[PDB]
From a paper:
In the NRC immune receptor network of solanaceous plants, multiple sensor CC-NLRs can signal redundantly via an array of downstream paralogous helper CC-NLRs termed NRCs (NLRs required for cell death) to confer disease resistance to a multitude of pathogens and pests. Here, we show that the coiled-coil helper NLR NRC2 from Nicotiana benthamiana accumulates in vivo as a homodimer that converts into a higher-order oligomer upon activation by its upstream virus disease resistance protein Rx. We show that unlike the canonical CC-NLR AtZAR1, NbNRC2 forms a homodimer in its resting state. Mutagenesis of various residues in the NbNRC2 homodimerization interface led to impaired self-association and effector-independent activation, suggesting that homodimerization contributes to immune receptor autoinhibition.
Author numbering:
A (entry chain A), B (entry chain B): 152 to 655, 660 to 885
Write the structure that this text describes.
């Protein structure tokens, strides 16, 4: 409930939505960036009354650099998982598909954030039919002319009010002091600050983060108070607010300063993968820690400082509470840009400006880090060359093929390249000079034809992370990854057939921690003997090769003492019944996360999982577990999160003793579940619960469980209210 | 000498060039389009005094849609034939290469036609160094601000004057009446017209063509006189002059109207290949002739009407006088556009306008013929679909690769496609749905990976012309081209291994006329037995397989009675001496054109060629003939043109009886020629003569021959003055 002073505005907006015309209706929210337009939209999205009243709730991100085809793909992905048929149809075809998808449903609302030009609104409006079902469009805009120019915009342009003072002091106190009370010698400074921010929440949260970072001293509070007083916030000039961000930026440590500045190289509206980005922090040497925690731990700590300062906003978190997807505010992105080019020339972006001509070698040679986001193919066709370029950064929501003749240009022009992520570029093959980059550390790309990883990859002695994505069924690795001592991580989407190591000095790879998806045949004794420090393991392929009762290779997994994350993917031609678990003591004594996919195991097998006393997060995906009768056997003494998706389970019996400490519980696509155990509502730690494609009997059992737990909350000191998801509410 | 009234302007421009500053100097020529800027530039280029004074003379075409990399490639192609090393270097690298290439030479001039914006001039000027050698730049522009903005443009902007009336009447009379005298009842109309064109040569030539097309009657002359009087030519509004072109356009026949309008679909500044374009018409059914001449003959007649009306201007002609490269004036191109979209909606062009968004299906479905010239890859990535599209037209000076996943989009979106020329698009493979186009007639594309022509190509029963270009050494054709009765032409750049026909109805392909270079092993008896009407033959590969004395296959060529054009390319691993011709009577009795490449034959072999009494044009390319002593044996009773390039010939003896009727004579890269026969100057028909990379002894022999022939011209009635090329004059 981190929303202060928006209750009246949200209530009046909701009143506008539920009332008004009975046909199509669009409400525009205009305001100076950072004032709370998207935050208010998110509050409206999560409000219970509107969600109950609206059958379908879609969140859409537009941004300035919107792609209509990409946007239509994004909307289509929210309806049908089988997206292979929609990749070929032209844009109006997916527009009609969206039209009929929302036609099949009931009353719906569409949320369009950060629309910059009226022509974009006109081009996207064609996908929303007028079915006289009181469908609503929550449009957010920076300019009132966008709403004014539309004849169909019958609703008056709602100018969202700026934050009131009563909201100010309370908001800033909640942000910076949390549950603490401000000392008297800082209270007047806080009030003066709140009056001096001119009710702009982004400025308030950024100065709160700055105050947290340095210390809660009266002198520093007076300094920031006079600084914000020296910067009057004009209602028509947002750039001065960037100066306030400067008052935060100077307070960060030099390496942390640098990583925050590098965080701005990403495109606006881009949902950053957390794991990818921590790798960018590590590969570039930005993360330096002379302490007991690992470098990845230090990078996670830095991300935690970023989020708690409200500099980087997290949109989706992992099931266990970790950060999954983070992004930067568009105003903060513009400030980071302005700093990057006009102030400290750390890195530069190459964009198709009004001149429509790309920079030549003379200007490019002065760059140190590049970031090409659109029209990359033309730029690489120009064949640039940078002798002082240390990085190549490029993310796009669309995949761009790699011209073969143009392939050798990138390595030849950048011999001093260190990191090179082209995950939006589909490499067709490997060039010889690509193999000459001895200074490379991070390489990640996609391919649709590469089957054999060549031997010469072993001669890159400075690579730290290697990420490969492909649509091929099986991937063969011929390069000697075992002698690559500095290699730390691997991530693959296909079945990776690692070479069988040969036994010959400290050849043991103590730095290798995570190695993503590996074919079952490579999970041998020698492979795990060379990496005792492995923590995350992933197996992809015919799991029957792993888990035959007579010659199961999981005995080798027993000797891996440092393992905590295991992933198994079943790609066998036949995935029928007959699979069973080995004795429970075979597993590592300190494993934490295991995920079973397409295993087709009997329910009783969790008894093996019942022996592990430290299991806390478990995920079942794509027919991990099934069986008509599920009886809870054994006690999961430390289970916190269990995640089951698309199982034909019918009946489940459970008790509080079986799962004494569960916190997160998820069922998805359970088309045959009869009832959820009532006694689960008797567990105090049971907090969050969700349904998807469940039976009506499951729905009424869920409602009864919610009522019982709410009554228990009325009985005991259950501070954390129960969370139930009525999805879909149709 | 078709230049009237420009003698004074050309003389003063030449005086400016030879005089002025001793360093870099740029003369700009500004004027309303069609006034004669490029024509005056061409006259200056071909003037003898400037060519003698200037060591290096380069012609450069810029146009509005100029590409700096393409332009630099074009300039580099004029210096070194080995262009494989220059394809990889970045733009400034070829700029420096051009800098040193002109540095090695002496005083030079660079001609830049049709420069539209000053920034283009600034970006191209960096390739021209200041060596204090009085180098000159003939720049042609439409706006004086382009010259004014340049600080280095010390020379005053020369505003070229409009043609005077005395030149006018003479110019129009030379254009329309040639050597005839205007009747008195049309002379006053001609004078009134010439005064009413306001001295604009393009208008004069177009109305002369219109008058020629309809008839030289007094009433029609009065009609065109009042029409041009009704259209006053404003000096600042060129669009009204387009109306005058209308007075010509309405006078053409409907099919000829249509083909002229289709001629405008090509990009401005594009040098049209004549053969391709007659193929494009013959495929679209535009050429209809109910007469004895072939359809190709009718198309050539139409092109002749186009050129003699000055609607289409020819830049380079074939050695025998035929049209090789033709183009349209930029003002005429704009008029053709205006007519195409705003008037008769015959065809439309898809371009990246200020909106920066490509048309959708709704507008595209109303189109009948398309023409995409730039940013084609984005358009095909959009995946357009046209149910009423009958043609797909795309030429570019650069090669664009074909995305595999995007490959199927083109055929699926255009099932009613008839012609499809993507010769600027590099196809990587064949898609199955591409093979579903049963309405296709003309297909032409380039590839760097296609080795096997698939069988299903035989199921396209409506194909008339098939053109394939590839860099592969050998091309295999598996499709049954023999049962393709409507197929008329084939053109390949690689060795084409045709399938061996099997003997089984009129299966004989009487419509097949030309079939490009074909691998030697396919020149069998059965192949030539199925196409008795063949006229142009081409063989590419190991010619030793064709021409072994014991088992030569040219006996089969004997039975081909309709053959007139033969091409042979030697791609054998060893091309050493030992090759010899068969007896002369083996050849068809009516052959006209033969070309020998890399044959390595003895000189005496022309005795066989001496037997053919109707040989008129012969070309020797890439070591066709060699030998220290060349003695002329036999009499070429009808030889007109002989063409020899890069031979190590030393001594040649010839007489007038050997070549009694030669007209065009060419020697290129003769690094060892001792002397040219003096008696060749005694031949009356000897008119044109050229040298390239010749010896100094060859140069002085050439000068003596020129002096002797000029003295003979002073003796006899040699109306056609002798033409000698001082090339290079360094
Ligand atoms: N009621 C509120 N309580 C706390 N923070 C808020 C509130 N409204 C806005 N904010 C903060 O203001 C910032 C700007 O939010 P957002 O609406 O996403 O951008 P914009 O206002 O430009 O659309 C957010 O980071 C958010 O944390
Ligand atoms: N002195 C001349 N004699 C005959 N025709 C001319 C003369 N000068 C120009 N023309 C004609 O005028 C037309 C325009 O010529 P050009 O110079 O190529 O275009 P622009 O004047 O727009 O540069 C040409 O087709 C040419 O035939």
């Amino acid at each position: 409930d981190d929303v202060v002073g928006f209750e009246e505005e949200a209530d009046k907006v909701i009143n506008r939505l539920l009332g008004g015309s009975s046909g199509l209706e669009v409400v525009p929210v205009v305001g100076m960036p950072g004032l709370g337009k998207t935050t208010l939209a998110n509050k409206i999205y999560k409000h219970p009354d509107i969600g109950y009243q609206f059958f379908t709730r879609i969140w859409v991100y537009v941004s300035q650099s919107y792609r209509r085809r990409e946007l239509f793909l994004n909307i289509i992905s929210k309806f049908t998982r089988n997206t292979k048929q929609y990749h070929d149809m032209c844009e109006e075809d997916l527009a009609d598909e969206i039209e009929d998808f929302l036609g099949k449903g009931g009353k719906y609302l569409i949320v369009l954030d950060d629309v910059w030009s009226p022509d974009a609104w006109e081009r996207i409006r064609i996908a929303f039919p007028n079915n006289n079902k009181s469908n609503r469009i929550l449009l957010t805009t920076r300019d009132s002319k966008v709403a004014k120019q539309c004849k169909q915009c019958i609703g008056i342009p709602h100018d969202l009010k700026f934050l009131t003072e009563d909201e100010s002091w309370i908001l800033l106190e909640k942000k910076v002091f949390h549950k603490d009370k401000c000392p008297p010698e800082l209270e007047l400074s806080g009030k003066s600050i709140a009056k001096k921010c001119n009710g702009l929440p982004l400025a308030i949260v950024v100065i709160a983060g700055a105050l947290i970072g340095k210390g809660k001293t009266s002198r520093e509070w007076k300094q920031v108070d006079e600084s914000v007083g020296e910067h009057l916030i004009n209602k028509d000039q947002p750039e001065n607010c960037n100066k306030l961000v400067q008052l935060s930026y100077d307070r960060l440590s030099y390496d942390l300063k640098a990583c925050f500045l590098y965080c701005g190289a990403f495109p606006g509206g881009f949902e950053i993968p957390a794991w990818k980005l921590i790798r960018l922090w590590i590969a570039e040497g930005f993360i330096q820690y002379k302490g007991h925690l690992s470098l990845e731990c230090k990078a996670e700590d830095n991300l935690n400082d970023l989020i708690n300062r409200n500099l980087v906003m997290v949109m989706q978190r992992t099931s266990d509470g970790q950060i999954k997807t983070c992004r930067l505010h568009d105003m903060l992105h513009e400030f980071c840009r302005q700093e990057a080019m006009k102030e400290e020339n750390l890195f530069q972006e190459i964009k198709l400006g009004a001149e429509q001509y790309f920079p030549g070698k003379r200007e490019l040679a002065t760059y140190r880090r590049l970031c090409i986001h659109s029209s990359v193919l033309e730029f690489i066709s120009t064949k640039p060359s940078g002798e002082h370029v240390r990085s190549f950064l490029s993310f796009s929501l669309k995949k761009i093929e790699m011209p073969s003749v143009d392939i050798p240009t990138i390595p030849k022009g950048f011999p001093l390249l260190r990191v090179f992520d082209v995950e939006s570029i589909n490499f067709s093959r490997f060039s010889k000079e690509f193999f000459q980059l001895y200074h490379l550390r991070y390489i990640a790309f996609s391919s649709d034809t590469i089957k054999i990883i060549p031997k010469h990859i072993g001669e890159l002695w400075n690579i730290q992370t290697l990420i490969i994505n492909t649509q091929q069924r099986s991937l063969d690795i011929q390069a000697n990854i075992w002698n690559m001592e500095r290699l730390r991580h691997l991530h693959t989407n296909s079945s990776a057939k690692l070479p069988v190591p040969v036994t010959p000095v400290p050849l043991v790879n103590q730095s290798l921690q995570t190695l993503s998806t590996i074919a079952p045949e490579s999970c041998t004794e020698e492979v795990f003997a060379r990496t005792p420090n492995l923590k995350k393991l992933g197996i992809r392929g015919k799991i029957a090769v792993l888990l035959e009762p007579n010659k199961s290779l999981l005995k080798n997994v027993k000797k891996l003492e440092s393992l905590e994350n295991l992933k198994l993917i079943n790609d066998s031609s036949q995935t029928g019944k007959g699979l069973r678990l080995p004795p429970s003591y075979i597993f590592p004594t300190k494993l934490r996360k295991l995920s079973l996919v397409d295993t087709w195991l009997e329910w009783n097998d969790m008894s093996i999982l019942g022996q592990m006393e430290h299991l806390e997060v478990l995920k079942l995906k794509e027919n991990g577990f099934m069986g008509e009768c599920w009886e809870s056997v054994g006690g999961f003494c430390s289970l916190l999160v269990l995640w089951i998706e698309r199982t034909d389970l019918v009946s489940w019996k459970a008790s509080a003793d079986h799962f004494p400490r569960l916190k997160h519980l998820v069922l998805i696509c359970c088309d045959k579940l009869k009832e959820i155990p009532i006694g689960l509502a008797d567990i105090r730690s049971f907090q969050v619960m969700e349904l998807q494609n469940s039976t009506k009997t499951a729905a009424i059992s869920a409602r009864g469980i919610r009522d019982k737990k709410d009554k228990q909350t009325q009985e005991g000191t259950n501070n954390n209210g129960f969370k139930l998801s009525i999805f879909p509410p149709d």
